[PDB]
Write an enzyme that holds these catalytic residues in place. Structure first.
Site, PDB file in Angstrom:
ATOM      1  N   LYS A  89      33.107 151.725 -86.012  1.00 13.01           N
ATOM      2  CA  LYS A  89      31.816 151.085 -86.220  1.00 13.01           C
ATOM      3  C   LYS A  89      30.674 151.922 -85.658  1.00 13.01           C
ATOM      4  N   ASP A  90      30.947 152.743 -84.644  1.00  5.64           N
ATOM      5  CA  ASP A  90      29.930 153.595 -84.047  1.00  5.64           C
ATOM      6  C   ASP A  90      29.698 154.888 -84.824  1.00  5.64           C
ATOM      7  N   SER A 123      30.596 143.447 -71.390  1.00  6.50           N
ATOM      8  CA  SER A 123      29.412 143.203 -72.194  1.00  6.50           C
ATOM      9  C   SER A 123      29.267 141.732 -72.547  1.00  6.50           C
ATOM     10  N   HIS A 137      31.447 147.862 -66.313  1.00 14.44           N
ATOM     11  CA  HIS A 137      32.888 147.676 -66.312  1.00 14.44           C
ATOM     12  C   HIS A 137      33.320 146.450 -65.514  1.00 14.44           C
ATOM     13  N   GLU A 144       1.361 162.080 -76.414  1.00 16.60           N
ATOM     14  CA  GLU A 144       2.352 161.771 -77.434  1.00 16.60           C
ATOM     15  C   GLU A 144       2.429 160.268 -77.670  1.00 16.60           C
TER      16      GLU A 144
HETATM   17  C1  CN3 Z   1      16.070 156.065 -85.696  1.00 16.24           C
HETATM   18  C2  CN3 Z   1      17.454 156.086 -86.345  1.00 16.24           C
HETATM   19  C3  CN3 Z   1      18.513 155.547 -85.387  1.00 16.24           C
HETATM   20  C4  CN3 Z   1      19.814 155.279 -86.163  1.00 16.24           C
HETATM   21  C5  CN3 Z   1      20.353 153.847 -86.266  1.00 16.24           C
HETATM   22  C6  CN3 Z   1      19.309 152.748 -86.151  1.00 16.24           C
HETATM   23  C7  CN3 Z   1      19.915 151.406 -86.524  1.00 16.24           C
HETATM   24  C8  CN3 Z   1      19.083 150.297 -85.880  1.00 16.24           C
HETATM   25  C9  CN3 Z   1      18.878 149.133 -86.840  1.00 16.24           C
HETATM   26  C10 CN3 Z   1      18.785 147.849 -86.028  1.00 16.24           C
HETATM   27  C11 CN3 Z   1      20.191 147.297 -85.851  1.00 16.24           C
HETATM   28  O1  CN3 Z   1      21.018 147.935 -85.299  1.00 16.24           O
HETATM   29  O2  CN3 Z   1      20.491 146.038 -86.369  1.00 16.24           O
HETATM   30  C12 CN3 Z   1      20.554 145.996 -87.762  1.00 16.24           C
HETATM   31  C13 CN3 Z   1      20.655 144.542 -88.190  1.00 16.24           C
HETATM   32  C14 CN3 Z   1      21.953 144.303 -88.945  1.00 16.24           C
HETATM   33  O3  CN3 Z   1      23.023 144.321 -88.051  1.00 16.24           O
HETATM   34  P1  CN3 Z   1      24.161 143.166 -88.271  1.00 16.24           P
HETATM   35  O4  CN3 Z   1      25.377 143.501 -87.453  1.00 16.24           O
HETATM   36  O5  CN3 Z   1      23.598 141.840 -87.840  1.00 16.24           O
HETATM   37  O6  CN3 Z   1      24.545 143.115 -89.868  1.00 16.24           O
HETATM   38  C15 CN3 Z   1      25.732 143.718 -90.287  1.00 16.24           C
HETATM   39  C16 CN3 Z   1      25.755 143.869 -91.805  1.00 16.24           C
HETATM   40  O7  CN3 Z   1      25.442 142.644 -92.400  1.00 16.24           O
HETATM   41  C17 CN3 Z   1      27.139 144.317 -92.258  1.00 16.24           C
HETATM   42  O8  CN3 Z   1      27.130 145.684 -92.520  1.00 16.24           O
HETATM   43  P2  CN3 Z   1      28.553 146.393 -92.936  1.00 16.24           P
HETATM   44  O9  CN3 Z   1      29.307 146.800 -91.698  1.00 16.24           O
HETATM   45  O10 CN3 Z   1      29.381 145.421 -93.734  1.00 16.24           O
HETATM   46  O11 CN3 Z   1      28.228 147.727 -93.833  1.00 16.24           O
HETATM   47  C18 CN3 Z   1      27.585 148.775 -93.176  1.00 16.24           C
HETATM   48  C19 CN3 Z   1      26.172 148.931 -93.708  1.00 16.24           C
HETATM   49  C20 CN3 Z   1      25.478 149.967 -92.837  1.00 16.24           C
HETATM   50  O12 CN3 Z   1      24.498 149.347 -92.067  1.00 16.24           O
HETATM   51  C21 CN3 Z   1      24.168 150.013 -90.886  1.00 16.24           C
HETATM   52  O13 CN3 Z   1      24.372 151.169 -90.748  1.00 16.24           O
HETATM   53  C22 CN3 Z   1      23.548 149.208 -89.757  1.00 16.24           C
HETATM   54  C23 CN3 Z   1      22.489 150.015 -89.026  1.00 16.24           C
HETATM   55  O14 CN3 Z   1      26.249 149.360 -95.038  1.00 16.24           O
HETATM   56  C24 CN3 Z   1      25.100 149.224 -95.826  1.00 16.24           C
HETATM   57  O15 CN3 Z   1      24.090 148.822 -95.351  1.00 16.24           O
HETATM   58  C25 CN3 Z   1      25.190 149.607 -97.306  1.00 16.24           C
HETATM   59  C26 CN3 Z   1      23.880 150.192 -97.850  1.00 16.24           C
HETATM   60  C27 CN3 Z   1      23.963 151.714 -97.949  1.00 16.24           C
HETATM   61  O16 CN3 Z   1      19.602 144.226 -89.052  1.00 16.24           O
HETATM   62  C28 CN3 Z   1      18.698 143.235 -88.648  1.00 16.24           C
HETATM   63  O17 CN3 Z   1      19.021 142.295 -87.999  1.00 16.24           O
HETATM   64  C29 CN3 Z   1      17.250 143.382 -89.086  1.00 16.24           C
HETATM   65  C30 CN3 Z   1      17.051 144.809 -89.586  1.00 16.24           C
HETATM   66  C31 CN3 Z   1      15.573 145.072 -89.855  1.00 16.24           C
HETATM   67  C32 CN3 Z   1      14.869 145.458 -88.554  1.00 16.24           C
HETATM   68  C33 CN3 Z   1      15.078 146.929 -88.187  1.00 16.24           C
HETATM   69  C34 CN3 Z   1      13.838 147.479 -87.480  1.00 16.24           C
HETATM   70  C35 CN3 Z   1      14.239 148.483 -86.406  1.00 16.24           C
HETATM   71  C36 CN3 Z   1      13.003 149.269 -85.973  1.00 16.24           C
HETATM   72  C1  HEM Z   2      18.999 156.281 -71.082  1.00 15.88           C
HETATM   73  C2  HEM Z   2      20.317 156.294 -71.085  1.00 15.88           C
HETATM   74  C3  HEM Z   2      21.163 155.009 -71.248  1.00 15.88           C
HETATM   75  C4  HEM Z   2      22.443 155.039 -71.609  1.00 15.88           C
HETATM   76  C5  HEM Z   2      23.275 156.290 -71.942  1.00 15.88           C
HETATM   77  C6  HEM Z   2      22.939 153.692 -71.657  1.00 15.88           C
HETATM   78  C7  HEM Z   2      24.220 153.319 -71.995  1.00 15.88           C
HETATM   79  C8  HEM Z   2      24.647 152.032 -72.205  1.00 15.88           C
HETATM   80  C9  HEM Z   2      25.842 151.615 -72.900  1.00 15.88           C
HETATM   81  C10 HEM Z   2      26.897 152.539 -73.533  1.00 15.88           C
HETATM   82  C11 HEM Z   2      25.883 150.287 -72.886  1.00 15.88           C
HETATM   83  C12 HEM Z   2      26.975 149.403 -73.516  1.00 15.88           C
HETATM   84  C13 HEM Z   2      26.694 149.188 -74.997  1.00 15.88           C
HETATM   85  C14 HEM Z   2      25.424 148.434 -75.282  1.00 15.88           C
HETATM   86  O1  HEM Z   2      25.202 147.344 -74.703  1.00 15.88           O
HETATM   87  O2  HEM Z   2      24.628 148.930 -76.114  1.00 15.88           O
HETATM   88  C15 HEM Z   2      24.717 149.809 -72.189  1.00 15.88           C
HETATM   89  C16 HEM Z   2      24.411 148.490 -71.964  1.00 15.88           C
HETATM   90  C17 HEM Z   2      23.305 148.028 -71.310  1.00 15.88           C
HETATM   91  N1  HEM Z   2      22.228 148.789 -70.928  1.00 15.88           N
HETATM   92 FE1  HEM Z   2      22.093 150.868 -71.061  1.00 15.88          FE
HETATM   93  N2  HEM Z   2      21.909 152.853 -71.297  1.00 15.88           N
HETATM   94  C18 HEM Z   2      20.792 153.617 -71.029  1.00 15.88           C
HETATM   95  C19 HEM Z   2      19.575 153.089 -70.636  1.00 15.88           C
HETATM   96  C20 HEM Z   2      19.307 151.771 -70.328  1.00 15.88           C
HETATM   97  C21 HEM Z   2      18.015 151.203 -70.006  1.00 15.88           C
HETATM   98  C22 HEM Z   2      16.710 152.018 -69.967  1.00 15.88           C
HETATM   99  C23 HEM Z   2      18.167 149.891 -69.784  1.00 15.88           C
HETATM  100  C24 HEM Z   2      17.140 148.804 -69.386  1.00 15.88           C
HETATM  101  C25 HEM Z   2      15.956 149.039 -68.837  1.00 15.88           C
HETATM  102  C26 HEM Z   2      19.567 149.589 -69.941  1.00 15.88           C
HETATM  103  C27 HEM Z   2      20.129 148.343 -69.786  1.00 15.88           C
HETATM  104  C28 HEM Z   2      21.339 147.952 -70.301  1.00 15.88           C
HETATM  105  C29 HEM Z   2      21.888 146.617 -70.296  1.00 15.88           C
HETATM  106  C30 HEM Z   2      21.213 145.369 -69.684  1.00 15.88           C
HETATM  107  C31 HEM Z   2      23.075 146.663 -70.906  1.00 15.88           C
HETATM  108  C32 HEM Z   2      24.057 145.490 -71.143  1.00 15.88           C
HETATM  109  C33 HEM Z   2      23.729 144.722 -72.415  1.00 15.88           C
HETATM  110  C34 HEM Z   2      24.735 143.650 -72.717  1.00 15.88           C
HETATM  111  O3  HEM Z   2      25.906 143.768 -72.295  1.00 15.88           O
HETATM  112  O4  HEM Z   2      24.355 142.666 -73.391  1.00 15.88           O
HETATM  113  N3  HEM Z   2      20.229 150.752 -70.279  1.00 15.88           N
HETATM  114  N4  HEM Z   2      23.984 150.902 -71.787  1.00 15.88           N
HETATM  115  C1  LIG Z   3       4.543 164.191 -73.131  1.00 14.32           C
HETATM  116  O1  LIG Z   3       3.526 164.793 -72.392  1.00 14.32           O
HETATM  117  C2  LIG Z   3       2.257 164.247 -72.584  1.00 14.32           C
HETATM  118  O2  LIG Z   3       2.054 163.486 -73.460  1.00 14.32           O
HETATM  119  N1  LIG Z   3       1.189 164.625 -71.683  1.00 14.32           N
HETATM  120  O3  LIG Z   3       1.499 165.332 -70.505  1.00 14.32           O
HETATM  121  C3  LIG Z   3       1.174 166.692 -70.533  1.00 14.32           C
HETATM  122  C4  LIG Z   3      -0.185 164.243 -71.951  1.00 14.32           C
HETATM  123  C5  LIG Z   3      -0.895 164.901 -72.835  1.00 14.32           C
HETATM  124  C6  LIG Z   3      -2.337 164.508 -73.103  1.00 14.32           C
HETATM  125  C7  LIG Z   3      -2.878 163.510 -72.455  1.00 14.32           C
HETATM  126  C8  LIG Z   3      -2.062 162.744 -71.430  1.00 14.32           C
HETATM  127  C9  LIG Z   3      -0.816 163.081 -71.194  1.00 14.32           C
HETATM  128  C10 LIG Z   3      -0.016 162.296 -70.166  1.00 14.32           C
HETATM  129  O4  LIG Z   3       0.057 160.954 -70.540  1.00 14.32           O
HETATM  130  C11 LIG Z   3       0.711 160.156 -69.598  1.00 14.32           C
HETATM  131  C12 LIG Z   3       0.622 158.665 -69.440  1.00 14.32           C
HETATM  132  C13 LIG Z   3       1.445 158.346 -68.388  1.00 14.32           C
HETATM  133  N2  LIG Z   3       1.960 159.486 -67.967  1.00 14.32           N
HETATM  134  C14 LIG Z   3       2.896 159.550 -66.859  1.00 14.32           C
HETATM  135  C15 LIG Z   3       3.315 160.714 -66.428  1.00 14.32           C
HETATM  136  C16 LIG Z   3       4.302 160.801 -65.271  1.00 14.32           C
HETATM  137  C17 LIG Z   3       4.743 159.707 -64.699  1.00 14.32           C
HETATM  138 CL1  LIG Z   3       5.900 159.809 -63.345  1.00 14.32          CL
HETATM  139  C18 LIG Z   3       4.263 158.352 -65.199  1.00 14.32           C
HETATM  140  C19 LIG Z   3       3.411 158.282 -66.195  1.00 14.32           C
HETATM  141  N3  LIG Z   3       1.594 160.588 -68.609  1.00 14.32           N
END
Ligand code: CN3
Ligand code: HEM
Ligand code: A1D6K
Ligand code: 8PE
Ligand code: HEM
Ligand code: HEM
Ligand code: HEM
Ligand code: UQ6
Ligand code: UQ6
Ligand code: 6PH
Ligand code: 6PH
Ligand code: 9PE
Ligand code: 9PE
Ligand code: 7PH
Ligand code: A1D6K
Lengths: 62, 385, 93, 51, 126, 49, 385, 126
Positions: B228-229, B206, B202, B272
């Site tokens: 958008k979210d 961002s 805050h 895991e």
């Molecule tokens: C596990 C599930 C969690 C759920 C959510 C996960 C989403 C994470 C995906 C990564 C990401 O957030 O960035 C995606 C990025 C595009 O973001 P951008 O703002 O640059 O483009 C806005 C767009 O052009 C307009 O998109 P617009 O807003 O106009 O329409 C919405 C769109 C829906 O797309 C989405 O939901 C985005 C996730 O509608 C359609 O696609 C219609 C088809 C049904 O794309 C890229 O830059 C590269 C994407 C490939 C790499 C992904 C690998 C991730 C592991």
């Molecule tokens: C696990 C629970 C977490 C929650 C609920 C959380 C929540 C958020 C939210 C709502 C934002 C603003 C939106 C966004 O930038 O996506 C944010 C930004 C950010 N978070 Fe987290 N976060 C988490 C973990 C982390 C971790 C693990 C890291 C890094 C090690 C991290 C680093 C940051 C940074 C650097 C930003 C600012 C990014 C920017 O403004 O460009 N957060 N976080």
């Molecule tokens: C989800 O649970 C598992 O996968 N566990 O735990 C039963 C598992 C199961 C089979 C073999 C090994 C593990 C553990 O593997 C690891 C590797 C790193 N950490 C660790 C743990 C605590 C802290 Cl502070 C920091 C690092 N643990």
């Protein structure tokens, strides 16, 4: 250039704005999204609350 | 003024949710922080409804979880959602952290926000580890044995720490009852660190994908970025539902459906998928004490990045060399997981050693050298004499 | 309360940027335009344009690490066959 | 003319270097209170002349 | 981060040297074209991070006419990026316009901070 | 022993969530249409000031 | 400026602990809020260290608490501190609330602070009730039976609420395992309400014993009121230690050392001393549904006081009639506890009825009538014609 | 709370009546002496709670000389109370000095708030 000249918006404008219709389609979609998410919220709450009812082994000894 | 601005409690909601100024150009990668907040609500709620039916005694534990599956109404929904919800929580966090690394969000003025985040990550690995042990199958017993015996190498003080962690002379009943009570606690500490994390955002707000100021063009949060979210909330729920209801045991190991037995060792003890890269870093160090130091050092080397980036530009958007080595580091992190799921055999021994080096050389040797080279190239391309 | 140490971002009215002069902005209502208007000419024009730019930074790294996993997995399976038992007892020592 | 520093000048080091020894003590003082009764360090924590 | 005084010291050494300039300049030009900040309508000095006191000082000393244009280029680039398009090729920054307009104000503020800071930690003779 | 019930509740849940995801894309693009087509013009002022 | 004023996190400590302006004239009655914060830390810490050794199964529960007493190192210290720490927590809260009633702290501009406090009180009775049931002795079983069967009188919906609360057809194993998981939770909800309680105090600050403004003479908190609070911390820790180590079972009942048995009813079912006045209000109403409404109405009639005090002066310091009836109400609250520990016999039946009326007539009939009389007496004593 | 307009309406009725004044005034005088606010050096109008808009208005309209004295009486009373003493008997407020110095400013601000409020909810004839 003067500030009284509006730029070109003819790529994005409508048939005729037709306010009877421009409001029709946006609010059907906002209504459907509220209908489905209120039903989904009601299935989620009832799934969690029913887990607190008597288990199968307790009903077998009933 | 409006009530939402005058009331003590709604004023905080308005300043964080409704009227917050946001840069106009932020993309969908900025939506992961919202999802991590829904994830924490899913896990806390599903876990409290299961704790009503769980027994922590070592002779009762495995059979309590099978009793949640068979006799509890909708109990198979609670467990599979909960078990697969932790795999999803970790995947969204890795993408959240990789984003900040790409766009330079660690840099000043946001060094304090990066450090509170590194703490959340450590406390989250601890939580998941403690919960897997409470199932008390065969990966639960032998995983806790391997990790807790690491602390017996600390000089002169180690064998006192393991016996105080165990409550005895081995992983036994006192170990499983204390790990469940701590596993309930740490989620409420993560929530308190998430509030401190938001307070530090805050102050400066961002960043944006271009790496320049955003004070010249701002949009309020409500009805541009709230809607958008919703787009990514429903995609998250859809993919999660597809795992819970149609493929609910693909992100697990079958041995944890065998009950825990100290007298029969499994042929492969494997964590895991989300702790495998750190498990390969440990196995790569021949000495026991240096191994446990190098593993925890892999989490805390992230705190060194605000002082090793030597560039006058924030982010990688306009940086050619720094893009290539960002994606080297990502795919080196995926190989460490694969090697962590293999047997200790040639050539997977040397592969994990070279890849453990590349993990550490990125933060300490690569970033300083390419950042300095890129600065000087920007200068001589414009100022040429 | 008291005021704390100030920032690089303000609030509405005093956001803290430079003074602006000579810029004009125009806009049209969304109710007066048609939505879902061009989203082909989007997935085929812009997505393919955005892909074509940022794909050699992601795929050359991916090709080096996948080749590495291959030659290791191929060699391991040879070591534990019967045609590679002599090499195993050489390298495992 | 020249003395070197990183906001922590060389003779800003040695106007506090005694007090570093003293607060190095203040933490020595702070934990050999803290961990007697812990069954480990007992080896050389009642090496004292009495007790 | 690295100082612009150090960046200029290394660069000037490379540029005055004939062999190094014939070897390192073409690499630097195509590093600029591949970056792609001109295609959004920005000069390089628009990209320098501004959340530090030396850079806040340089922006106050800037003339009014150069400061109004900088604000417009930055707004135009944010709008170009949220639409996921590029600008027309007749609105791209050309090479002769990509001048270091802010560097002299930066080097002047840096040299004064070093002089002040040496004077606050001086070793005096007798 | 929950195999048959589970596969039928997942058909209900996947149909509902799939339509909400498409409806959310529609609603977003409508409420964002003003920002995407907004236009800017610059006329350099006189540096009198 | 100073670091304690510029840092995001220390700025909140400074504004609440160090530089906070306080009225110069506040007395030792303003020190109870500090003690209630140490109380909550004592209970949460002692409880988490016991949860490592507790088993919630109905066949294992009583014997787990006796195992904490005999086999756990210093476990008798944890339980007696914990059990007697709840009796002390309730006594400091009654004195904190009685103070605010005497000095008019409920009045505007502090109506919001009084209402968040009434919520904390309700959630605190719930917590203690759930914990006493987890011992599962003979006052634990039959106390939960009497209270949970009250909800079977709600029209058309009652017998569905009791069976969902029980998890069956009686107080049984599913009841005891769900009451322990909820008993761990509610303390963390009380802590979140304590933060919202402090936010509402920071707006207008604290009142003072004279009932006039304090903006003309203010003292900072550090080193006048920090060291004034140490005085009462050490007196609290002395008296508590005297109960834990020298008389650790005088604030309890012997029947709860008998294990719980559904087939043998005790001769006297009696709550702890701090729920007895509310237990006498319930027993005084012949009808079952009206009784459970009148008992919860005894807690929420406190919300009516900001609108029934009709006086232009804040507090009772200069009010003669309103002092007499403040101390009538206090000693009527002590008789209700006594009658709640008696058998249902003549004349303790009518005594508890008349005393239940006086509890309600104070807030609704006495305060409005004496406040109006006192206003008019102030006028005619000065303005006489 | 109760309005000073209503307090004055009831009081004036009691005072104009001979029988009621002979019956209710001695009770009111000894209610004043038993309260004990004069022994701390306060007049009654010092005790009225001030966190409301009608009372904030009355304190602005008060003359400067009467306002400086009110601030001193309030500071002196806080200091007397933290020491748990009383003031000397030659510094106690006497009966002839315990005057309603602020009542006319209160009744004037109340009558204007009622007139304004009636006018904002009027029923008009035709
Ligand atoms: C596990 C599930 C969690 C759920 C959510 C996960 C989403 C994470 C995906 C990564 C990401 O957030 O960035 C995606 C990025 C595009 O973001 P951008 O703002 O640059 O483009 C806005 C767009 O052009 C307009 O998109 P617009 O807003 O106009 O329409 C919405 C769109 C829906 O797309 C989405 O939901 C985005 C996730 O509608 C359609 O696609 C219609 C088809 C049904 O794309 C890229 O830059 C590269 C994407 C490939 C790499 C992904 C690998 C991730 C592991
Ligand atoms: C696990 C629970 C977490 C929650 C609920 C959380 C929540 C958020 C939210 C709502 C934002 C603003 C939106 C966004 O930038 O996506 C944010 C930004 C950010 N978070 Fe987290 N976060 C988490 C973990 C982390 C971790 C693990 C890291 C890094 C090690 C991290 C680093 C940051 C940074 C650097 C930003 C600012 C990014 C920017 O403004 O460009 N957060 N976080
Ligand atoms: C989800 O649970 C598992 O996968 N566990 O735990 C039963 C598992 C199961 C089979 C073999 C090994 C593990 C553990 O593997 C690891 C590797 C790193 N950490 C660790 C743990 C605590 C802290 Cl502070 C920091 C690092 N643990
Ligand atoms: C202890 C902590 C260690 C943690 C290690 C972290 C490893 C976790 C792996 C997570 C993978 C996520 C990788 C992507 C990182 C997110 C940020 C990002 O890549 O930026 C998106 C970028 C946008 O494109 P532009 O450069 O044009 O900038 C925006 C326009 N102004 O466009 C791009 O850069 C390309 C986007 C494509 C992303 C997909 C490439 C990776 C594919 C397979 C990954 C497999 C992961 C399992
Ligand atoms: C950040 C939040 C949490 C995470 C990441 C987490 C993680 C886990 C994991 C990975 C497991 C093992 C899954 C398996 O069965 O294979 C587990 C099990 C369990 N967890 Fe959690 N947990 C969280 C919060 C909680 C909370 C707050 C509770 C209790 C209120 C809880 C209660 C349980 C229980 C009872 C089990 C038993 C095994 C099961 O039912 O699957 N969890 N947890
Ligand atoms: C506001 C805070 C709390 C209050 C007022 C409270 C109250 C109580 C009470 C009255 C009892 C019964 C005492 C007896 O044995 O006679 C009890 C028992 C118990 N409580 Fe709590 N409790 C609180 C917090 C906690 C927490 C956070 C935990 C767990 C982490 C906990 C764990 C237990 C356990 C395990 C028992 C078992 C019986 C015993 O050991 O005495 N309590 N609690
Ligand atoms: C865990 C329980 C509570 C905690 C930790 C707590 C804490 C505090 C603290 C630290 C103060 C500062 C001033 C003072 O000590 O008087 C305070 C004031 C106050 N509290 Fe509480 N409180 C609690 C419960 C309650 C309850 C149950 C009520 C009323 C039903 C209440 C009503 C008030 C009021 C009215 C004040 C302001 C008094 C004045 O300024 O004259 N609080 N509280
Ligand atoms: C008039 O103005 C005042 C004022 O007078 C006072 C006194 C205070 C101070 C008084 C307070 C009541 C604030 C104190 C805060 C609380 C009571 C909230 C406590 C919240 C919690 C969440 C407590 C939990 C404590 C823990 C230690 C949880 C962690 C548990 C552990 C470490 C044990 C388990 C661990 C292991 C390893 C087994 C004010 O804040 C204040 O405001 C300006
Ligand atoms: C950038 O701007 C943003 C922003 O983008 C976002 C997304 C958020 C949204 C939120 C977050 C990022 C995370 C914050 C989340 C928390 C602190 C989570 C707290 C979690 C919980 C799970 C609390 C749960 C409490 C309970 C009482 C439920 C548990 C159990 C129950 C109800 C069972 C008992 C039931 C019965 C019937 C007995 C912001 O706040 C924000 O402002 C900065
Ligand atoms: C900070 C975190 C960002 C993501 C937050 C997502 C939370 C959802 C809240 C959306 C509220 C929209 C404001 C309402 C409004 O303006 O008027 C509404 C419009 O919106 C709706 O009708 C509801 C649409 C979607 C359902 C809301 C729940 C979504 C699913 C929740 C899943 C859990 C997260 C009233 O309709 P009307 O204006 O036409 O009269
Ligand atoms: C928060 C609401 C008030 C509740 C009471 C607070 C109790 C906890 C704080 C203890 C006071 C510490 C302040 C001392 C200080 O900083 O001034 C230090 C004093 O420190 C010293 O050297 C003397 C040792 C301190 C004595 C500690 C007494 C008891 C400690 C805790 C007991 C267990 C609860 C002097 O510096 P200062 O005058 O600028 O503040
Ligand atoms: C505690 C976690 C740490 C972070 C802080 C949490 C902040 C998030 C709170 C969420 C918003 C809660 C909605 C409050 C609704 C409006 C309150 C209100 O009307 O204020 C009061 C009445 O409130 C009450 O009587 C009790 C409210 C208890 C609420 C318990 C949830 C209205 O009074 P007033 O008009 O004077 O507004 C206050 C001006 N400062
Ligand atoms: C109400 C619930 C939640 C809010 C809690 C607020 C009260 C919590 C008290 C916190 C105690 C103080 C914490 C550390 C204070 C120093 C922070 C600091 O120096 O900031 C950073 C260091 O960054 C960090 O590593 C933060 C670690 C956080 C530790 C988590 C406990 C440097 O200081 P910074 O320059 O940002 O301060 C600005 C003033 N010029
Ligand atoms: C808080 C948990 C949210 C987790 C969502 C992840 C996706 C898996 C869904 C599992 C839901 C279990 C209930 C169920 O199976 O219902 C099913 C219905 O499917 C749905 O409607 C999807 C619900 C999700 C929509 C979003 C709700 C918003 C959250 C509400 C919080 C107030 C079947 O229920 P039924 O008994 O047949 O009525
Ligand atoms: C500390 O525990 C006991 O004293 N318990 O409970 C086992 C006990 C023991 C014997 C007899 C009666 C009781 C119960 O007495 C009462 C009286 C009122 N409540 C109550 C409970 C919850 C809520 Cl929300 C509101 C009011 N409970």
């Amino acid at each position: 250039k003067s500030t009284y000249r509006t730029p070109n918006f003819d790529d994005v404008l409508k048939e005729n704005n037709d306010a009877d219709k421009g409001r029709s389609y946006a609010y059907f979609m906002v209504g459907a999204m509220g209908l489905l998410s209120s039903a989904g919220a009601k299935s989620t709450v009832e799934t969690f609350i029913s887990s607190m009812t008597a288990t199968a082994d307790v009903l077998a000894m009933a | 003024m409006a009530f939402r601005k005058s009331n003590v409690y709604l004023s905080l909601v308005n300043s964080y949710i409704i009227d917050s100024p946001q840069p106009s150009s932020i993309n969908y990668w900025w939506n992961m922080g919202s999802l991590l907040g829904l994830c924490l609500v899913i896990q806390i709620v599903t876990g409290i409804f299961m704790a009503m039916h769980y027994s922590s005694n070592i002779e009762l534990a495995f059979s309590s979880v099978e009793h949640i599956m068979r006799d509890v109404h909708n109990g198979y929904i609670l467990r599979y959602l909960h078990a697969n919800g932790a795999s999803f929580f970790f995947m969204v966090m890795f993408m959240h952290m990789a984003k900040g690394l790409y766009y330079g969000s660690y840099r000043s003025p946001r060094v304090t926000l990066w450090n509170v985040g590194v703490i959340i990550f450590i406390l989250t690995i601890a939580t998941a580890f403690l919960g897997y042990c409470c199932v008390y199958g065969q990966m639960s017993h032998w995983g806790a044995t391997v990790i807790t015996n690491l602390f017996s190498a600390i000089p002169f003080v180690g064998n006192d720490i393991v016996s105080w962690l165990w409550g005895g002379f081995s992983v036994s009943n006192p170990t499983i009852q204390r790990f469940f009570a701590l596993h309930y606690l740490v989620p409420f500490i993560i929530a308190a660190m998430v509030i401190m994390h938001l307070m530090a955002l805050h102050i400066h707000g961002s960043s944006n994908p271009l790496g320049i100021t955003g004070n010249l063009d701002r949009i309020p949060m409500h009805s541009y970025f709230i809607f958008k979210d919703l787009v990514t909330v429903f995609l998250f729920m859809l993919i999660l539902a597809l795992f819970v209801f149609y493929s609910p045991n693909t992100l697990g190991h079958p041995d944890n459906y065998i009950p825990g037995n100290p007298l029969v060792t499994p042929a492969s003890i494997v964590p895991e998928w989300y702790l495998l890269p750190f498990y390969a870093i440990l196995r790569s160090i021949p000495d026991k004490l240096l191994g446990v130091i190098t593993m925890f050092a892999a989490i805390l080397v992230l705190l060194v990045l605000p002082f090793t980036d030597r560039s006058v530009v924030r982010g990688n958007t306009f940086k050619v060399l720094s893009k290539f080595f960002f994606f080297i580091f990502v795919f080196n992190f995926v190989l460490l997981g694969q090697i962590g799921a293999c047997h200790v055999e040639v050539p997977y021994v040397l592969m994990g050693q070279i890849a453990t080096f590349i993990y550490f050389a990125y933060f300490l040797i690569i970033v300083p050298v390419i950042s300095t080279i890129e600065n000087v190239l920007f200068y001589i391309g414009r100022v040429n004499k | 309360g008291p005021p704390s140490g100030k920032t690089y971002m303000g609030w509405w009215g005093h956001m803290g940027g430079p003074k602006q002069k000579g810029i004009t902005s125009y806009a049209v209502s969304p109710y007066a335009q048609k939505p879902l208007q061009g989203i082909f000419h989007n997935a085929v024009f812009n997505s393919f344009r955005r892909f074509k730019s940022q794909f050699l930074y992601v795929l050359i790294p991916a090709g080096i690490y996948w080749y590495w996993w291959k030659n290791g997995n191929e060699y391991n399976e040879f070591l534990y066959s019967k045609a590679g038992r002599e090499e195993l007892e050489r390298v495992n020592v | 003319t020249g003395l070197h520093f990183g906001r922590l000048s060389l003779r800003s080091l040695t106007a506090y270097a005694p007090n570093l020894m003293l607060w190095g003590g203040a933490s020595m003082l702070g934990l050999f209170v803290f961990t007697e009764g812990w069954p480990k360090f007992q080896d050389t924590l009642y090496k004292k002349i009495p007790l | 981060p690295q100082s612009f005084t150090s960046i200029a010291r290394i660069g000037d050494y490379i540029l005055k040297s004939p062999v190094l300039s014939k070897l390192c300049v073409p690499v630097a030009n195509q590093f600029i074209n591949l970056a792609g900040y001109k295609k959004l309508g920005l000069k390089f000095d628009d990209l320098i991070a501004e959340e530090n006191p030396i850079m806040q000082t340089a922006l106050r000393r800037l003339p009014e006419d150069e400061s109004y244009a900088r604000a417009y280029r930055i707004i135009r680039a944010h709008q170009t990026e949220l639409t996921h398009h590029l600008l027309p090729r007749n609105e791209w920054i050309k090479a002769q316009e990509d001048v270091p307009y802010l560097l002299p104000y930066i080097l002047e503020a840096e040299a004064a901070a070093k002089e002040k800071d040496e004077l606050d930690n001086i070793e005096v003779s007798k | 022993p929950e195999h048959d019930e589970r596969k039928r509740l997942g058909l209900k849940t996947v149909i509902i969530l799939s339509s909400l995801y498409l409806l959310s894309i529609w609603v977003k693009k409508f409420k964002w249409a003003g920002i995407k087509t907004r236009k800017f013009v610059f006329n350099p002022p006189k540096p009198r000031k």
